[PDB]
Amino acid sequence: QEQLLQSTFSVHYLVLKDMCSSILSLAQSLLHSLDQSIISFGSLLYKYAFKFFDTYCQQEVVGALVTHICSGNEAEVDTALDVLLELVVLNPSAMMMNAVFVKGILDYLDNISPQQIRKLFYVLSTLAFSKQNEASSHIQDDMHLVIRKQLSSTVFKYKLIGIIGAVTMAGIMAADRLSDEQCTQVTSLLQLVHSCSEQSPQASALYYDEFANLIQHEKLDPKALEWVGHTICNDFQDAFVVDSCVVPEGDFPFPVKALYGLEDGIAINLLPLLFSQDVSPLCLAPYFRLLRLCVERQHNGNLEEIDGLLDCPIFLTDLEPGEKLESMSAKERSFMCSLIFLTLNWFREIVNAFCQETSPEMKGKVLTRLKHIVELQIILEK
């Protein structure tokens, strides 16, 4: 059992220390198994060796873990990353001087899944910001430059890795337990990620998805929330929200009108941006989720600021098939099928935002949107 192993190391680490190389070879072999009982014991054999042995055998523990993360096995990489996180939390000072070897995993991100890349950045970020000593500051600025040269990489995969790593670092950077100079430093990191991902729509979508998950599941400093909510709210208004007074204009081969309104107003300018692509409209749903969460966090669940987005109409064409389904060309249906998907995704995200309300007419609008999702979904199969 764990307690037998814990008691063994605790009082008789003097005799076990002579054979740290032998124990680690045993620990490494145990980790190659397929049973959780064996895998958990092998991970414990790594953790107890790091805790009770000397500096040299501790470097062997970290070096052994780095090999597992670079091995390729999903089971080994996941387990070894958990061991590394435990070691960082347990003994940040000992892991502080082993960061050079941990940094070396960044050279082998090709054979690592995006889920494991996020975890690898989390342990690196939490180790770099564990202490405020001069040793940490070297790693902190080292981690910033690694991501900075990944964000600007021409290779698209490394551009996405830079977004994942930079959003992950900002979570530890702004984690609530923050001075102004830290608050502007994390803000500058986000401004870097925003600028780099602006051109690519799918890369821009990843930034919204990763940063929204950070707001939802992590508690950050209020000042950090103050800036992010301000920049998102105004940019979203300028990007998609348009006034309903001004009639639409363009060279559209379809009649463009305001559709799916409720009951001088704002509207979602969905169709012209989609047509001009013949902020991207493909990012409308992930961006709005980011806006909703940031507004919610500052006001502690209160959401009067985005009330108009629920009932605002959507600029859409005559989506009902007027006995012209066969005459429709391939380009027109392919465009319109994407029109339905973006409209459905917007309505699904709208439902997500206002599903926790209490007021009666507040709920009826959500149900009306839910009805709109169902009926407009039937139109999709046409």
Whether the CB-CB separation of 358 and 338 falls below 8 Å is answered with: no
Stretch of 145-153, 162-170, 286-294, 358-366 contacting other proteins, by CB under 8 A: 145-153
For the CB of residue 105, give the shortest distance to other proteins in the complex, in Å: 13
Separation between Cα atoms, residue 208 and residue 211, nearest integer Å: 5
- In this chain, which of 29, 93, 137, 188 binds other proteins, going by CB under 8 A? 137
In the bound state with other proteins, the residue whose beta carbon lies nearer, of 137 and 276, is 137
Q: Which of 138, 157, 299, 363 lies at the binding interface for other proteins (CB under 8 A)? A: 138
| 154 or 358: CB nearest other proteins | 154
| SS3 label, residue 220 | strand
CA distance 183 to 163: 19
Is 110 a binding residue for other proteins by CB under 8 A? The answer is no
The 8 Å CB, 24+ separation contacts for 7-12 are 9/48, 9/49, 9/51, 9/52, 10/52
Q: What residues form DSSP beta bridges with 175?
A: 220
Tokens standing for residue 24: 């680690």
Q: Binding residue for other proteins (CB under 8 A) from 35, 54, 110, 134?
A: 134
The pattern of x and - marking residues 51 through 90 that bind other proteins according to CB under 8 A reads ----------------------------------------
Residue 100 interacts with other proteins (CB under 8 A): yes or no: yes
Closer of 37 and 132 to other proteins (Cβ): 132
Which CB atom, from 148 or from 348, has the smaller least distance to other proteins? 148
If the CB atoms of residues 92 and 313 are measured against other proteins, the closer one turns out to be 92
Stretch that binds other proteins, among 49-57, 60-68, 152-160, 299-307 (CB under 8 A): 152-160
Using rule CB under 8 A, residue 93 touches other proteins: no
Q: Residue 229: what residue type?
A: G
Q: Contact between 375 and other proteins (CB under 8 A)?
A: no
Stretch that binds other proteins, among 97-105, 262-270, 334-342, 352-360 (CB under 8 A): 97-105
Three-class SS state of 305 = coil
DSSP, residue by residue, 327-371:
TS-HHHHHHHHHHHHHHHHHHHHHHHHTTT---HHHHHHHHHHHH
Closest CB to other proteins among residues 100, 337:
100
CB atoms within 10 A of CB 25: 13
146-155: which pairs have CB atoms within 8 A and are 24 or more residues apart? 146/103, 146/106, 148/192, 151/192, 151/193, 151/196, 151/197, 152/196
Token duo for residue 180 = 């102004």
Distance CA 140, CA 131 (A): 10
141 binds other proteins (CB under 8 A): yes
Taking the least distance from each CB to other proteins, the nearer of 135 and 256 is 135
Helices H / strands E in the chain, number of each: 19, 4
Residues at the interface with other proteins (CB under 8 A): 99-100, 103, 134, 137-139, 141-142, 145-146, 148-149, 152-154
